[PDB]
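Hi team,

Filling in the usual template for the complex we talked about on Friday. All components are listed, including any nucleic acid strands or ligand strings, so the model treats them as one assembly.

SUBMITTER: L.P.
PURPOSE: interface mapping
COMPONENTS: two
RESIDUES: 580
SEQUENCES:
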Amino acid sequence: IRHYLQFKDFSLEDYEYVLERTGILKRKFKNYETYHPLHDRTLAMIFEKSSTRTRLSFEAGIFQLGGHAVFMSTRDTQLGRGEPVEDSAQVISRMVDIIMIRTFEQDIIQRFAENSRVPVINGLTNEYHPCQVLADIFTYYEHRGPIRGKTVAWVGDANNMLYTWIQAARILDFKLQLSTPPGYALDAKLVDAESAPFYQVFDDPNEACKGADLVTTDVWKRAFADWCVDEEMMSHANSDALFMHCLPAHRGEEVTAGVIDGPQSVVWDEAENRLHVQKALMEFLLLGRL
Amino acid sequence: IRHYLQFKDFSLEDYEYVLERTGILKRKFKNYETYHPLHDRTLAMIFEKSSTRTRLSFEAGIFQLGGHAVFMSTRDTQLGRGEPVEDSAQVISRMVDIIMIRTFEQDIIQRFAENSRVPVINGLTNEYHPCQVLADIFTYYEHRGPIRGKTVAWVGDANNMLYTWIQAARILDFKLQLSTPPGYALDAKLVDAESAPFYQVFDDPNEACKGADLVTTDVWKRAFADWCVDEEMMSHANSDALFMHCLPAHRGEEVTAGVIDGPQSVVWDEAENRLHVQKALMEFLLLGRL
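RESULT (copied from the run log):
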């Protein structure tokens, strides 16, 4: 059983395949071609943190592959609290073919996975958000070609997106340049020492953006003010740099309207591409390589 | 309405597309992937010259694409005799989506096509056999890579296969080297003068095979004896040359058992590939490029 819990669960080879499948399945999507490799297959969507966006992307995605997603959300309990992790994992994986969990803690999805008969996908935890970084990287390929050797700048809080980017940089061999406000820096305990050669920390976010091919941030306040991605910051990056932001976005906080609504922003395509990479993920976890 | 009556009906660009589709659809075939772009579509197979082989290849091919082939063969009449060409074309093309005709004369399939509401494919005439040369060239790609600039040797009678090869040489820009017995040479009236730069005639078939990447012949007798493709003849070609023969074959006539049953022969793969190129043909004529 393979799972998709952290970006580093897949090898370079895995990603080369999945990214190519993503483009192929997207073309089938845009060609209204009927392709149902997952006919009669069920995905359990376990949401403990709400997102319609991600419900839509997974739900429409497996439908388009011939399968069906079941939305599982409870108000008053959660895995590891008021629901026993193993009980849920053993029973649910006996009924469905694949499972997605969006929750708070990586430890919980990991423990669940350990007792699951079927593949488990991380739809977001406090620690990692591999599906979005995957979509981000696919979006880059589409607009700018392969990301290898390119420079990605991260400006903002050290949050699940950043830790995921760090893992990606190592695996896909690109350069990550990051800058955070002084008290919201990387937790050196949550960063693999093996990834040190692939990222660099800057005190000034404007320096981190110099020569960037991709500039990205996320939602976080009086302290983050110099870490707002504005148009002057963007001007430090390469002229054809892309701006990505994982949604939702708060205009006037992490980012200006000028940037996210500007000509370098690909945030909508980037959100759309969650649908396409997640379809490739599910196909790959269930069918392997063709 | 586009038709497929002669090899030269398609451009270089058309062939690059169709050959790539052929490989893609063959992979779907080998992956047991359900792909039915031709669902609810009908092919009329009009056979005035019998071939189970070609009935199988077209019939199984459209089935695998979700459609259905209707076998139409009469004992006592034929198009242009006892059946009016236009009457058949007007009525049949009102009922089906695509038509294949295997018959004697190119003039007849051409006249039929002129009055057909749907695409017409030449499944073989006395003058041309484009589906087989297409399969032959696909088979070459599979085993040896793109045919461009390569050398194809034709040894034997000047028959529909040869005239088709000549058209192919011009379009795909490879070198054709041909040799026939003195009285069974090219009919200069049936050869486009524009294709002269792409073929060369040799009095000695062994010379025609020198430096060949592909050696090929067909069924035709006391005169053809020096034009038998044997192992000494094959030894004149490049060491990794392929031997192709459009089936059926008569061992001990045009070709030896030693050659056609030998390690350079790809005649079975070549016959199989009629199925795959013809599926790409039908998809292309009905759907165009994706």
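MY TAKE: The interface with chain A takes residues 27, 31, 33-37, 290 of chain B (CB under 8 Å). Chain B has two domains: 1-131+274-289, 132-273.

Thanks, L.
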